[PDB]
Ligand binder design. Structure first.
Ligand SMILES: [Mg+2]
Ligand SMILES: [Mg+2]
Ligand SMILES: [Mg+2]
Ligand SMILES: [Mg+2]
Ligand SMILES: [Mg+2]
Ligand SMILES: [Mg+2]
Ligand SMILES: [Mg+2]
Ligand SMILES: [Mg+2]
Ligand SMILES: [Mg+2]
Ligand SMILES: [Mg+2]
Ligand SMILES: [Mg+2]
Ligand SMILES: [Mg+2]
Ligand SMILES: [Mg+2]
Ligand SMILES: [Mg+2]
Lengths: 25, 121, 81, 96, 206, 216, 97, 129, 87
RNA sequence: AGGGGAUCGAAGAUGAUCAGAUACCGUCGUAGUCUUAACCAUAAACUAUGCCGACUAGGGAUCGGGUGGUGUUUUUUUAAUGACCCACUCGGCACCUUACGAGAAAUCAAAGUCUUUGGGUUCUGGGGGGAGUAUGGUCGCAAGGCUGAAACUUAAAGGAAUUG
């Protein structure tokens, strides 16, 4: 896939992981 | 299309190159001497060659042709080539030269007449 | 060119060249002995002066500065020195 | 000037620059991080003894159609599970 | 050196200044050409006809050093010089090439236009660039009639002239042939004016 | 029969030129391999590799073969020829021809102590073709040729007994390695040395001495 | 690889050139990279001028012209039978016909 | 900025010799440049040269024959011992028969053969051949 | 060059350019050897009496052969004011 | 966060087209686009070419400054100017031709003066992926930025050109 959209996907994933970890932190 | 091939054109060029004080603007006698003076296997090709020779002779009757050269043409060319006037235009008719040229002559140290005129910008 | 004398060039070429880029660099500027009308009292004036020079006798005006050479006034007589 | 310093008192720069750019290698990195001793089911050893658990019919990669007659092995010193290939015609019948 | 009979005579100077050989190019100037004398207004540069004559005599000596005159070759793709090179070939040996050069004439040992000369003479090195290029492949010197803006590369003796002109080219060829014949011994009289007129080597539109 | 069409060919057939040294001295261009076959009758050919080269077409791949040939007598002369042809034999024939045409001299010399019969090169030399640079360094006696097989064979046919080699690039391109080595050993007579500082009187060429035994 | 030394345009020594809009597709394109043409045209035609002159009061008059400077993007210019496409060698030709 | 004037001098000489010129102008004329050129002259690699005394630093106009293939500079001026001389000469000369590595010793600037004769070593400046 | 006891080796001591004193390689086909005829007492040329000047491909390619030959001829006496040392 | 808010317009709503079309096309349209005071610190932020310095080929044009010329024109025929022309020069933005040279080539007056390897100096890379990911720090209101692995996997990925 286009690298821009791979980057956008990775960023949305990093955000969701940040919050699912804030659940426990 | 009625475009001739290089066999026909080369054969006609050669026939003109060495049989000009000869064959004329008539396809019939040009054919009847083509079969006399060349070895051609087929009547069709003979007649094509004769037609192209007639066409080229019609061309030659009005000026020269590029690619062709026969002895009469060569002699005319060299005769015109040896032309010279009797005045030798470089010869003096009255010579003009600018101030820089007068300076050049003076530098070389030579006796010459000069009709100096000024060169303006 | 592949062969030339770089020690004895032509004065034409050296005057064509920039002052620093000559064989020995030196100034293309000069000084002038200037006479103002009236008070003789000649004044020494540099060609590229940078100042509105005027004679000590009176404040007439001798040269006005420019980006390069100074412009000497209309009524004045100068002598390259 | 080709980058790198050439000065006669510029050796420390060259040393530490080499250290970093050596970490850029592969063999140096594996040797110094100690991956063999810390990973790599052996202990950086040449050989290792283990106990057979299961026989396997691993299918080959393409382009190749075959079954390669391997075995699962629990290593004695580490306890790690490992797949090993039994090389020859019919030698799986000695590894019961 | 020379016996001083070869210096520039007022007759030759009359010819050269009447043909306006001394009129060089405009402000354009190849720095390989120091043959200039005190540029005119109008931006036109004047040529040292004395240096022209000296280089011309040098080229004549080079030519006359060739034992077999047929090994000399004269090139002119311009129309203003074909009669000149042909009459040059008439009076000297000087195997001529007027019109087209036929690439592969000094290389390509099989073709029918194959010359293997010891010297080639050229009327304009920009229009005859194929010839000098192919001479740089096979160890051949090149004499050339240059203006002040011509490309000096792969050019040996350069005769400064006005190659823009009809009369200048023919005059330079005429003088060259005259000096060659004098050095060879046909013209026993160095002072004689060589009955052949200069306007023989001149272009005609008819 | 040969029937040469060249000034040089006519002179060589008449026997006026008995050595290629005159050809090399006057930088004369050769265009007939029979000249080299006449002057250097003792040189041997060697075929290095035959690689096929393919041209894609509407109807499949049109293939022809590239042959690299090194010719040489083992006293001072080598030539390299590379030819493509539809058939391997013809490739090799025409490559031998081109190699003979491409013959150059080799300036052999001493590592030191000029005892006798030079064995090495006189100078460090390099040649480059493509990415490949081949460097030849002079070596002492007994070192032999320290090189890969192909450059070793070229140098054997050139007559170099002792030489080191440093190399760089994709040396698996044998055409470029051989051409780099060829340029390197051709540069030996380009490098100026103090034993060549002496000025000589610029001799006269056979093409001007034997002018009538030439063209006609 | 690189195709052009100007890369597409006429920006040597600027940095930024303040785009314009294409006349057909409204695309934003830098002004230096744009294609500029100038479409000068008599108002009516070369055909109707006879009728206009015959039906006109004020003889001799002028029949003035219309002037507009056209900016096309690359895509529109190539589609509209303008700067179409050229060989690697003639790409360097910087002059008009 | 300008650090080694000798390097600029020898670069200019190298480029002139590559271009076939028979002369070159050096600025700004250091003492080590003078002694270096004197060595090259004593061994026959350049020819005459002339120091133009402007009151700043000097210029030099060198005459060049065609005998010079490469005159070079070794920067930094490494400290060189009596066997490192041999190591260098191997590395950076074409042959064991000609060419000179040049080194500033306490006994003046010289070539490495003279340095072997006088039995002294020093700092390496450059090379010529 | 030579071995321990004279006995010249190095076949083909090569030619050097008259302008740059650089060696003319065998594969340098842009090299030329100009022969200028001598004259004696009348203006006629002597056959077989030449003044020779070799020029290499580099000089011939940079466009400096004309100037080099000018100065070489002026030095050897068969020319005059054409060439100047000061440019 | 205030102001401002015409235009265009991520979202969104709609009309079509389409097998579908929550896309391209069309009509509306919030945020934004503007501004003030703060934040963010990223980009194909590109000449994809670090800065300083020297040398090495020709050609002409152009921007700025300066010099010279009985030069042209305008003024008050005239002066000084100013604007032009010619020649020259310093410093720039660039351009044309060639390759001595360089380069894998495309191409390059620098990407040259590099196996004939050293003018000074900073930064970065070491097969492809995983991965600019995980984790830890630090900055940030946040969005995110800076720093930054490993396991594991793989024989090819990739550059420039060539004929199809
Ligand atoms: Mg230091
Ligand atoms: Mg596979
Ligand atoms: Mg390698
Ligand atoms: Mg593309
Ligand atoms: Mg930008
Ligand atoms: Mg970035
Ligand atoms: Mg970047
Ligand atoms: Mg620089
Ligand atoms: Mg200016
Ligand atoms: Mg400028
Ligand atoms: Mg600017
Ligand atoms: Mg690696
Ligand atoms: Mg990697
Ligand atoms: Mg590609």
């Amino acid at each position: 896939m286009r690298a821009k959209w791979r980057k956008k996907r990775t960023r949305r994933l990093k955000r969701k992981r940040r919050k699912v970890r804030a659940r426990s932190k | 299309g009625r475009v001739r091939t290089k066999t026909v054109k080369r054969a006609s060029k050669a026939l003109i190159e060495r049989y000009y004080p000869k064959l004329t603007l008539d396809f019939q006698t040009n054919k009847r001497l083509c079969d006399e003076i060349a070895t051609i296997q087929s009547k069709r090709l003979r007649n094509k060659i004769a037609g192209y020779t007639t066409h080229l002779m019609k061309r030659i009757q009005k000026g020269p042709v590029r690619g062709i050269s026969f002895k009469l043409q060569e002699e005319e060319r060299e005769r015109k080539d040896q032309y010279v006037p009797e005045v030798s235009a470089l010869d003096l008719s009255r010579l003009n030269v600018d101030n820089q040229t007068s300076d050049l002559v003076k530098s070389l140290g030579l006796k010459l007449p000069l009709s100096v005129i000024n060169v303006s910008a | 060119v592949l062969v030339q004398d770089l020690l004895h060039p032509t004065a034409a070429s050296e005057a064509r060249k920039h002052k620093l880029k000559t064989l020995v660099q030196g100034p293309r500027s000069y000084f002038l002995d200037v006479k103002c009308p009236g008070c003789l009292n000649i004044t020494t004036v540099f060609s590229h002066a940078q100042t509105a020079v005027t004679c000590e006798s009176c404040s007439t005006i001798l040269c006005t500065p420019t980006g390069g050479k100074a412009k000497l006034s209309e009524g004045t007589s100068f002598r390259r020195k | 000037g080709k980058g790198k310093p050439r000065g006669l008192n510029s050796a420390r720069k060259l040393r530490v620059h080499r250290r970093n750019n050596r970490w850029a290698e592969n063999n140096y990195k594996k040797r110094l991080l100690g991956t063999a001793f810390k990973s790599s089911p052996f202990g950086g050893s040449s050989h290792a003894k283990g106990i057979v658990l299961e026989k396997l019919g691993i299918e080959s990669k393409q382009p190749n159609s075959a079954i390669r007659k391997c075995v699962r092995v629990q290593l004695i010193k580490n306890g790690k599970k490992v797949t090993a290939f039994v090389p020859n015609d019919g030698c799986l019948n000695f590894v019961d | 050196s020379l016996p001083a009979t070869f210096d520039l005579t007022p007759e030759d100077a009359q010819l050269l200044l009447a043909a306006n050989t001394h009129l060089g190019a405009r402000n354009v100037q190849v720095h390989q050409e120091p043959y200039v004398f005190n540029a005119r207004p109008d931006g036109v540069h004047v040529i040292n006809v004395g240096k022209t004559w000296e280089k011309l005599v040098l080229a004549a000596r080079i030519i006359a050093a060739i034992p077999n005159p047929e090994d000399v070759v004269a090139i002119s793709s311009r129309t203003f010089g074909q009669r000149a090179v042909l009459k040059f070939a008439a009076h000297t040996g000087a195997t001529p090439i007027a019109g087209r050069f036929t690439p592969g004439s000094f290389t390509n040992y099989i073709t029918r236009s194959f010359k293997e000369p010891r010297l080639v003479i050229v009327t304009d090195p920009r229009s005859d660039a194929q010839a000098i290029k192919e001479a740089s492949y096979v160890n051949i010197p090149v004499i050339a009639l240059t203006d002040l803006d011509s490309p000096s590369e792969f050019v040996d003796v350069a005769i400064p002239c006005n190659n823009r002109g009809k009369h200048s080219i023919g005059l330079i060829w005429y003088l060259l042939a005259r000096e060659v014949l004098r050095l060879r011994g046909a013209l026993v009289d160095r002072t004689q004016p060589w009955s052949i007129m200069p306007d023989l080597y001149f272009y005609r539109d008819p | 029969g040969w029937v040469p069409v060249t000034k040089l060919g006519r002179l060589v057939k008449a026997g006026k030129i008995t050595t290629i040294e005159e050809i090399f001295l006057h930088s004369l261009p050769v265009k007939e391999f029979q000249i080299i076959d006449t002057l250097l009758p003792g040189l041997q050919d060697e075929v290095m590799n035959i690689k096929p080269v393919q041209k894609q077409t509407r109807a499949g791949q049109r293939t022809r073969f590239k042959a690299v040939v090194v010719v040489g007598d083992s006293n001072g002369h080598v030539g390299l020829g590379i030819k493509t042809a539809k058939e391997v034999a013809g490739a090799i024939r025409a490559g031998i021809i081109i190699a003979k045409l491409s013959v150059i001299p080799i300036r052999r010399g001493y590592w030191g102590t000029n005892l006798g019969q030079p064995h090495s090169l006189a100078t460090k030399t390099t040649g480059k073709c493509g990415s490949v640079t081949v460097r030849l360094i002079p070596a002492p006696r007994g070192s032999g040729i320290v090189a890969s097989p192909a450059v070793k064979k070229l140098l054997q046919l050139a007559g170099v007994e002792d030489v080191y080699t440093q190399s760089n690039g994709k040396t698996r391109t044998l055409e470029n390695t051989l051409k780099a080595a060829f340029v390197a050993i051709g540069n030996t007579y380009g490098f100026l040395t103090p034993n060549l500082w002496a000025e000589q009187p610029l001799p006269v060429s056979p093409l001007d001495i034997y002018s009538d035994e030439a063209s006609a | 690889p690189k195709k052009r030394a100007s890369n597409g345009r006429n920006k040597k020594g600027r940095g930024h050139v303040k785009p314009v809009r294409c006349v057909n597709c409204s695309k934003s394109i830098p002004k230096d990279k744009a294609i500029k043409r100038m479409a000068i045209r008599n108002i009516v035609e070369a055909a109707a001028v006879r009728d206009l002159s015959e039906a006109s009061v004020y003889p001799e008059y002028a029949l003035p012209k219309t002037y507009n400077k056209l900016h096309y993007c690359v895509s529109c210019a190539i589609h509209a039978r303008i700067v179409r496409v050229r060989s690697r060698e003639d790409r360097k030709n910087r002059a008009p016909p | 900025t300008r650090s080694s004037v000798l390097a600029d001098a020898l670069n200019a000489i190298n480029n002139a010799e590559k271009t076939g010129k028979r002369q070159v102008l050096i600025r700004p004329s250091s003492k080590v440049i003078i002694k270096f050129l004197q060595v090259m002259q004593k061994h026959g690699y350049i020819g005459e040269f002339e120091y133009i005394d402007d009151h700043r630093s000097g210029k030099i106009v060198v005459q060049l024959n065609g005998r010079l293939n490469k005159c070079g500079v070794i920067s930094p001026r490494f400290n060189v011992k009596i066997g490192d001389i041999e190591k260098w000469t191997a590395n950076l000369l074409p042959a064991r028969q000609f060419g000179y590595v040049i080194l500033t010793t306490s006994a003046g600037i010289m070539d490495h053969e003279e340095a072997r004769r006088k039995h002294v070593s020093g700092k390496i400046l450059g090379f010529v051949y | 060059m030579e071995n321990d006891k004279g006995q010249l080796v190095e076949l083909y001591v090569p030619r050097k350019c008259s302008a740059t004193n650089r060696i003319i390689k065998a594969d340098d086909h842009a090299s030329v050897q100009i022969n200028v005829a001598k004259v004696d007492e009348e203006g006629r040329a002597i056959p077989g009496e030449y003044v020779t000047y070799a020029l290499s491909g580099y000089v011939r390619s940079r466009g400096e052969s004309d100037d080099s030959l000018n100065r070489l001829a002026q030095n050897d006496g068969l020319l005059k004011n054409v060439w100047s040392y000061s440019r």
